Amino acid sequence: NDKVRFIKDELRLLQEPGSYVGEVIKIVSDKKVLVKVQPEGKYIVDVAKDINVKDLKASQRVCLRSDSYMLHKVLENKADPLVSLMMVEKVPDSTYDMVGGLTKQIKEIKEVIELPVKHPELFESLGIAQPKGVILYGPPGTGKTLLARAVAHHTDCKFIRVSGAELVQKYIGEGSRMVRELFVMAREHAPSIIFMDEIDSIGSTRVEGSGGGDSEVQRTMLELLNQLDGFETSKNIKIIMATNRLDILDPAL
Amino acid sequence: TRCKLKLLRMERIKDHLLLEEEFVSNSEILKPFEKKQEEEKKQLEEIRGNPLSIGTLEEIIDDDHAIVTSPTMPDYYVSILSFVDKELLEPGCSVLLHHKTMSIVGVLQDDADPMVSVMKMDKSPTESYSDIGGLESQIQEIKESVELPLTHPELYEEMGIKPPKGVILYGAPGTGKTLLAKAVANQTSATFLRIVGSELIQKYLGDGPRLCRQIFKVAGENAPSIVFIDEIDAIGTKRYDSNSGGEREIQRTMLELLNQLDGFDDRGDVKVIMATNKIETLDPALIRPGRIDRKILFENPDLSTKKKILGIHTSKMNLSEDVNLETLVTTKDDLSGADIQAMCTEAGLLALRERRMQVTAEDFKQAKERVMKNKVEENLEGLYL
Amino acid sequence: AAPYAAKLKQTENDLKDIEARIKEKAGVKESDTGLAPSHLWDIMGDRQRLGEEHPLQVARCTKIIKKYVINLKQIAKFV
Amino acid sequence: KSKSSLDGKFSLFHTAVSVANGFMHAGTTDNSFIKANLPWLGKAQNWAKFTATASLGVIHKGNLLEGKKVMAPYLPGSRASSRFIKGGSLYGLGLIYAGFGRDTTDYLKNIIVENSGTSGDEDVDVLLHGASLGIGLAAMGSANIEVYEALKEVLYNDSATSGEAAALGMGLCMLGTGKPEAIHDMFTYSQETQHGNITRGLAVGLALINYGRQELADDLITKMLASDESLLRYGGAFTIALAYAGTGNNSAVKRLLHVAVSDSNDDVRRAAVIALGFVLLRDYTTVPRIVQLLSKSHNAHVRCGTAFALGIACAGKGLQSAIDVLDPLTKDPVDFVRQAAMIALSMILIQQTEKLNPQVADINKNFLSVITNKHQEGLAKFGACVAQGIMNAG
Amino acid sequence: RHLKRELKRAQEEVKRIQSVPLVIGQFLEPIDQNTGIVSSTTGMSYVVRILSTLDRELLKPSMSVALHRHS
Amino acid sequence: EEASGKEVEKVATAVLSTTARAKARAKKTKKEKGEFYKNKYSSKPYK
Amino acid sequence: EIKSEEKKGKSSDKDATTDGKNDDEEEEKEAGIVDELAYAVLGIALIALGEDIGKEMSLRHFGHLMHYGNEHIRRMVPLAMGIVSVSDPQMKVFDTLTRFSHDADLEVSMNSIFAMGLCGAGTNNARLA
Amino acid sequence: KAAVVKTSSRQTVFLPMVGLVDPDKLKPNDLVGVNKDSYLILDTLPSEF
Ligand SMILES: Nc1ncnc2c1ncn2[C@@H]1O[C@H](COP(=O)(O)OP(=O)(O)NP(=O)(O)O)[C@@H](O)[C@H]1O
Ligand SMILES: Nc1ncnc2c1ncn2[C@@H]1O[C@H](COP(=O)(O)OP(=O)(O)NP(=O)(O)O)[C@@H](O)[C@H]1O
Ligand SMILES: [Mg+2]
Ligand SMILES: [Mg+2]
C-alpha cells in the first residue's frame, strides 16, 4: 500500500516544468530580494512566504520556482564548479616517505606550509605576519607534484587541483572572470589548498609583451590576494603555484 | 582609559532604551500604517506584480515615455506609469519594471551592482598624513596641485592663472605610490572615490561605458572631490585575442572616460589622480596636458629616506632595538625601502628555522647578510669590461 | 574598572541585535515614490494600464523597398 | 467571529456562518443573530440570500405556534421583492414543521400545483426548488400519496434545479414504504434524464423510500449496482445502508466493501464508506480497525468518506479510537479532507465537558486557529465554522 | 490483490516519461542525496528531482546525463 | 471566547507587557539609586 | 483655541527631546558627544515611523543638535546629513545647520554653495524654499 | 524536391519544396520569404549584399 503511493508521488513531483537557482544579492524595504538568476539576468522577486527576510543573508544561494520564480528552499550546499573539482581530486593519501631523498626540500616544506594554517599565531610570533604564497620550480620528474600532495595529507585541508586556465570551463558565463572569481569560491570552501598549476607557456610573446588578455585575468586574481586580505589574516587558503621554470613565469609574480 | 569606559556606560542605556521605544512607537496604539499607507499600498500592488524585471534606463523623452533595455535583448518604447517623476529619475539608473507590461513602476535599485559598492567611500582614508616617513618633498608636490586649490582658490584667482588640475603618479614599484595618494587625500578630507580599473573592462558589450560615465557623474555631485583611478595601467594595450576583438569593447570604455573628463559640465573642481607604470603602456591619449598638469616621477628611496621607513619595521622585530638605528643603515648596502620589507621578512624567516624563541640582536644582524646575498645572486654577471 | 570592563563585552551583543532589527524597521512598507500629488496619478494609472499600446518593441529600417525590411535587435529579419 | 473574520459578500463564506449559527441558536427562536449581523446581512446575494431565509427556519425549529407567524412577511404574496426569499421561506417552514402537523402540508401542496407548468421564468425556478424540499419535510413519514403525485408533475416538467428537490421530496414524504409503483417510476425515469442533478436526486430518493425495507430491497440493489451509470451506482450504495441498518449484516457488509474495492469511480468509492457506518451504527467497536486501511487510500474522496463514516457511527458517546484515525486526516493537505475531519471530530465528543476530557480543549482551539489563518483555504475555514457550531449548538 | 494491479500500473506510467523523446544535459554535483543540480545543453541550470532507485555511485561525479524534456 | 474574543485578548496583553517594561524599568532603578480523569463523580450527594 | 492646547503639547515635547541631549553632551563629558550623535540618527527614524507630523519638528532641532553640542567633526557628517534633508520638508533645518558648518571655509563651504544651488535648480518646489 | 533554409530565427529547417515556387527560380543562396508559423518557402525576395 505504502509502496504504490511513493511511485505515484514521484510522478506527480516531476510534472512541474523548469525550476531554477539563483543567489540573493540584497534585501529591500518592501519585503522582496534581488536575485541573480544564475544563467539569466537579474530579477527582483519576493521571498517565499514561509521564510522571513531576517533568515536570509547576502550571497545566499537559493533555489527558485519557474512559474513565478518565487524562491523555493535555500541550497544546503553552494553551487560552484570548485566543489565538483575536489570530488574528483580526492583526499590525499600520499605521504613524505612515498618520495625518498631530496631530503632538504622535504624538511623545509613543512615549515613553509604546515604552520601558517595550524598555528597562524605561532608562525607570526617567532617570525612576522604570513607569506603571500609559494612558488615551486625545478627539474620535471623531481616529483614536485608528489611533494605538494604529501604535505597536504598531513595538513588535512581540501587539496583542490585547479589545473590550467578556467577558459576551459564554459558551464555558465564566460570562463574569463571565473579565474578571478576563484578567490570567492576558495573562501567559502575553506580549508583549501589551491594548487594553481599553470606553467605560463601560453606564449612567450605575451610574457615579454604588453599584449595578452590571459595576462590581464591572471593579474586581477593576484591583486585580490592583497586587497581583500581574506586569505592572509585568517590563513586557511594557501596559494600554492607551480611552474616548470622560474624564468617563463609572468613577471608580475 | 577612563574616557572609553564612559562611552560604554552611555551605550548600555542608549541601545536598551532604543529597542523598547521602537516597538511601542511604530505599532501598538499609534499603528504603523495609520491609514494613509494602506491607500498607497492597495494602488501599488495593482500596478505591480511579481516577478518584476530590473531594467537599465537609456534616455527619457518628456512625453511620459522612456527607452529601456531589460535582460532580454530588444529595447522597448515603454510608458512611464505613475510613481517616480521624470525629475526624480536619473538616466543611467537601474529601475523597476513590471513584467507583464513594462512600465516604470519606480526606482529603489540605484545601480545595485558590486562596482558601486567598491567605488563609494564617503569617509576619508585610513592613512593620515606623513605617518609615512621620507620622500617628504615628493609628497609636498602632490599637495601643491591637488589639495591647495580645493582648500583655497583665492591665491590662484589673484595670480590670474587657472588652478592646476590633475596629477599623474608614475615610476616604479616599491616607493609606495599608491599610499601617497591616500595620504594627500586624507588631509583635504575630500570625498575620495577609489576604483580598480580591471572592473571597468569586461567581455560583455556596452556595460563598460555605462559604468565609466557614472564615475564622472557621482564625482561632480560630491565636488570637492578626488577620483583615484588605480590600475589604469591594467587596461593598457592588452587585447583579448589578437585574431580580432579587443579593438571593439576596450576602445569604447577608454573613450567615455575622456569624453566626460572635461565633460559637458565644467569639472575643474574634480581632481584626478592616476597611478600607473607609464603612460606608454596605455595608448597615449590623456587629454588636456595642463588639465593633467604636473607629472610626478618617483625616485626610489635614498639613504636618508630608508632610515625612517626602517624604524617602523625594526619595532615589530622583538628586541632589535639593541642595534642602534644608525649603524643598521650604515653596514648594509644602499637599497630601496622595498628591500627593507624583504630584509625585515628575512629576520623572522631565520627566527622560524632556528626556533629562536625570542627575536634577538644576533638575528637582525644575520638577517642583513642573507638578504644582501640574495639580491647579488639573482643579478647576472655580464662583466663590466 | 572591572564593572565597566565587562560592559565592553555586553555592548557588542546589543549592536548585533540592532543590526537585524534594521530589517524590522523597513518592514513591508513602500519606500518608493507614489504619494503626495502623485497619489492622484495612480487612480488614472490603473485605466491606462489595461490599455495596450505599450510596451512596443523598438525596430529600425535597414532598407526601404518600394513595405520595409526591419532588422530587430535580436537579429531577426522581417518584411 | 462570523462578522469579523468571514466575509459576507463572498457567498461560500456566508453559507458557512449561516449554517453554524443556525444550529447555535437552534430549537428556540432567535432574532439576536439578525440584529447583530445586520450590515452583514445586506451584503448577501444570489444563493447566499436563499440560505439566509432558510437559516431562519433551522433557528426557529420548535415553538410551532410562532413558527408560521415569524415567516409571515417572507411568504409569497407578502414578498415578491426577491425570489430567493420567497422560495427559501417555504424550505424554512418545512424545517420547523418537520414531522409535526399536517395542517402545514396542505398549504404547500397548493403552491406546487400552481407552478407545475413552466419553471422557465427565472423567479419560478428558484421558488419551486424550496417548495419541493419544504413539503417533503413537512410530510415526513405521513405516506401521503397526494404529495407524491404533486412532485411527479415537477419532474416531468423537467424543471432545471427543482427537479432534484422534487425527487428528494418524494422519498422524505413516503419514507420507508417501499411502495413498488413509486420504485418502478423513479428508477426508469432516471435513465431518460440526461441532466445529472435530476438523476442524483432520484438515485438517492430510491434509497430513502426503501428505509428499513430489509431484504425486500434486494431487487433494487442488484439493478442499481449493475447500472452502467455512475450516478445510480452511487445511490445504489445508500440503498443497502438504509435498508440493512442497525444489526450488522454480513451480507450487507461484504457487499459494501466489495463495491468500494472494485468500482473505480471516485464518488462511488466514497458512497460505500459512509454507507458502512449506518449498518454498524450500534456496533462501532471494530469499525476503526476496518477503516484503518481506507485512510491510507491515495484517493482524496475515499479519505473524506472515511472521516464522515467514523463521525456517523460514534456520533453518540465518545470513543477514543476514532479520534486517532481522524488526527492525520485533519493535517492531510487536500482541503475537503481537512473539512471532513473537523466536522467528524465535534460529533463524536458532542457536548462532552472540557474539563472532563482534556482532548476536547485542544480540538476546539485548532478550529479557531484555522479561521485565523488566511493561508488555509476558503473551504477549510468553511469546515471550521460549521464544526464549532456543532460542538456548542442550541 | 487489488493494490497489486495499481502498483503495476503505477510503474507503467513512469516508463512513458522515462521513454523518448529525451534531451541531454550533464549532471553537475549533488545539493543533497536525492535532489541534485544539473546543467542542460541549453546552458540552463535546473535543480531537479532525482527519481527513486537510480544510479548514485557514479551519478555524483560530474557525468553526462538525460533529462525528460517536458518535466 | 471563540476566535473573536481571543484575538482581542491576545493583542491586548501584548501592548501592556511591552509598555510596562519600556518605562517601569528605567524609572524604578533610578528612583532608588539617587487529574482523576478516571475520578467519576465523588460518591457524595450533590443537589 | 481649544486647538492651541493640543498643538503646543506636541511641539514642545518634540523640542525637549532634542534639548536634553544637547544639555548633556555640551556640559558634561566629551565621550557622550559621540554617544548622542550615534543615537540621534536612529531616533529620527523612530519618530518618522510613529508620526508623519513628528518628523518635521524634529528635523529642525536635529541640525541644531550639531551647533549646540559642538561635535568633534564639522567636515564630513553635516554634509551627509544635509543631502538627506533636501528631500524632506523644511529648509529652516539648513539655517541652524550652517552655524556649525562654518569650519575652515572653502572645503565644507565649498561643498555648501555647490549643494544648495544645484537642488534649487533641480526642483523649484517653492520660492520660499 | 527539397530545400535547406537557414532562417533569420537562427534555426535550421529541412522543408518540402513548395511546388508552386519553381525549382528554376530558386537557386543556392537566394534570399526568400518564408511563412512565419509552418516553415515553407512562401515567396522570393530581391537579394541584399
Ligand atoms: N623522486 C621520485 N621517485 C620516483 N619516481 C619519481 C620521482 N619523481 C618523479 N617520479 C616519476 O616521474 C614522473 C614524472 O614526474 P612528475 O610527476 O611529472 O613531476 P614534477 O617534477 O612535478 N613536474 P612538472 O610540473 O612537469 O615540472 C612521475 O609520474 C613519477 O612516475
Ligand atoms: N615614502 C614611502 N611611502 C610609502 N612606502 C614607502 C616609502 N618609501 C618606501 N616605501 C616602502 O614601500 C613599501 C610599500 O610599497 P608597495 O605598496 O609595494 O608599492 P607601489 O609603488 O604602490 N606598487 P605596485 O606593487 O605596482 O602597486 C612600504 O611598505 C615601504 O617598505
Ligand atoms: Mg608537477
Ligand atoms: Mg600600488
DSSP line for chain A: -HHHHHHHHHHHHHTS---EEEEEEEEETTTEEEEEESSS-EEEEPPPSSS-TTT--TTEEEEE-SSS--EEEE-SS---HHHHHHHHH------GGGS-S-HHHHHHHHHHHHHHHH-HHHHHHHS-S--S-EEE-S-TTS-HHHHHHHHHHHHTSEEEEEES-SSS--SSS-STTTTTTHHHHHHHT-SEEEEEE----S-HHHHSSS--HHHHHHHHHHHHHHHT-HHHHS--EEEEEE-S-TTSS-TT-
Experimental method: cryo-EM
**Is ligand 1 within 6 A of the CB of residue A22?**
no
B170 DSSP assignment: E
| Rounded-to-integer distance, Cα H20 and Cα A183, Å | 63
What DSSP designation does B171 have?
A: S
Are residues A198 and A244 in contact, defined by beta-carbon separation less than 8 angstroms?
no
Residue among B133, B130, B95 at smallest CA distance from B311: B133
Strand B295-297 vs strand B167-170: parallel, antiparallel, or unpaired? parallel
Residue G35's φ and ψ, nearest 5 degrees, are -75, -45
Chains E and B touch (3+ CB pairs under 8 A): no
Query: What is the distance in angstroms between the Cα of B346 and the nearest Cα belonging to chain A?
Result: 9
Put simply, the answer to whether B76 touches C55 (Cβ < 8 Å) is yes
**Omega of the bond leading into C55 within 30 degrees of 0 (cis):** yes
Residue A15, Cβ density class (10 Å: 0-12 exposed, 13-18 middle, ≥19 buried): exposed
Count of CB pairs separated by less than 8 Å, B with G: 64
CA atoms within 13 A on the CB side of D179: 15
Residue burial B318-327, b: 16+ Cβ < 10 Å; e: rest: bebeebeeee
d(CA A116, CA A130): 7
Distance spanning both ends of chain H, measured CA to CA: 27
| C-beta of B196 in contact with ligand 2 (< 6 A) | no
Whether residue D368 lies within 8 A of chain F, CB to CB, comes out as yes
Task: Kindly determine whether residue G107 and residue B224, on different chains, have CB atoms separated by under 8 Å.
Answer: yes
Q: How many CB atoms lie within 10 A of CB C74?
A: 12
State whether residue F28 sits within 8 Å of chain B by CB. Answer: no
B171 labelled ligand-binding = yes
By the 10 Å C-beta count (0-12 exposed, 13-18 middle, 19+ buried), D311 is classed as buried
Strand B52-61 to B94-98 pairing: antiparallel
Cα separation, D73 vs D77, whole angstroms: 9
Q: Which residues surround ligand 4, an ion (CB under 5 A)?
A: B 178
Element (H, E) at B228: strand B225-230
CA distance D165 to D151: 9
**Are F26 and B29 within 8 A, CB to CB?**
no
For ligand 1, whether the C-beta of A140 sits within 6 Å is: yes
User: What are the chain B neighbours of G52 within 8 Å (beta carbons)?
Assistant: 36
G74: cell is: 564639522
- Determine, for residues E10 and A19 on separate chains, whether the beta-carbon distance falls below 8 Å: no
Q: Among the bound ligands, name the one nearest to the CA of residue A253.
A: 2
A212 is in an annotated binding site: no
The vertex-E53 CA angle with E63 and E48, nearest 5°, equals: 55
The residue with cell 419541493 is: D132
Residues 6+ away with beta carbon under 8 Å from A4: D298, E3, E6, E7, E10
By alpha-carbon position, which residue is closest to atom 27 of ligand 2?
A: B173
Which chain D residues are closer than 8 Å to F37 by Cβ? Answer: 356-358
Backbone φ, ψ for residue A37 (5° rounding): -75, 120
Using alpha carbons only, give the angle B207, B213, B216 rounded to the nearest 5 degrees: 145
D67 contacts: CB under 8 Å, gap ≥ 6:
D57, D60, D93, D96, D97
**Resolution reading in Å:** 7.8
Is B173 annotated to bind ligand?
yes
Report the alpha-carbon distance of residue A161 to residue A54 in Å, rounded: 37
Measured from the Cα of B138, ligand 2's closest atom is: 1
The answer to whether B176 touches B337, Cβ cutoff 8 Å, is yes
Rounded to the nearest whole angstrom, what is the distance from the C-alpha of residue E17 to the centroid of ligand 1?
50
Whether residue B305 is annotated as binding a ligand: the answer is: no
Do A207 and A250 contact (CB within 8 A), yes or no?
A: yes
Measured CA to CA in angstroms, residue A49 lies from A31, A32, D49, D372, D375 at distances of 10, 10, 36, 16, 10
Q: Which residues contact G47 (CB under 8 A, 6 or more apart)?
A: B25, G54, G55, G58
Give me the torsion for CA of B328, B330, B334, B337, rounded to 10°.
30
Q: Give the phi and the psi of residue A93 in degrees, each rounded to 5.
A: -115, -5
Phi and psi, residue D190, nearest 5°? -70, -20
Report whether A140 belongs to an annotated binding site: yes
Four-point Cα dihedral D49, D52, D53, D59, nearest 10? 180
Strand partners, B271: B226
φ, ψ of residue D18 to 5 degrees: the values are -65, -50
Burial B25-53 (b: 16+ CB within 10 A, else e): bbbbeeeeeeeebeebeebbeebbeebbb
Nearest C-alpha neighbor of D148 from the set D109, D206, D116? D109
Inter-chain touch C45–B82, beta carbons under 8 Å: yes
Please state, in angstroms and rounded to a whole number, the distance separating the CA atoms of residues D248 and D281.
Answer: 8
- d(Cα H38, Cα G73) in Å, to the nearest integer? 73
Contact D5 F6 (CB under 8 A): no
D364 to chain A, closest Cα gap in Å: 25
Residues of chain A contacting residue D293, judged by C-beta atoms under 8 Å apart: 1
- Does an interface of 3+ CB pairs under 8 Å exist between F and D? yes
Give all chains having 3 or more CB-to-CB distances under 8 Å with chain C: A, B, G, H
Measured between alpha carbons, how far is B18 from B157 in angstroms, rounded to an integer?
51
Total residue count of chain F as it appears in this document: 47
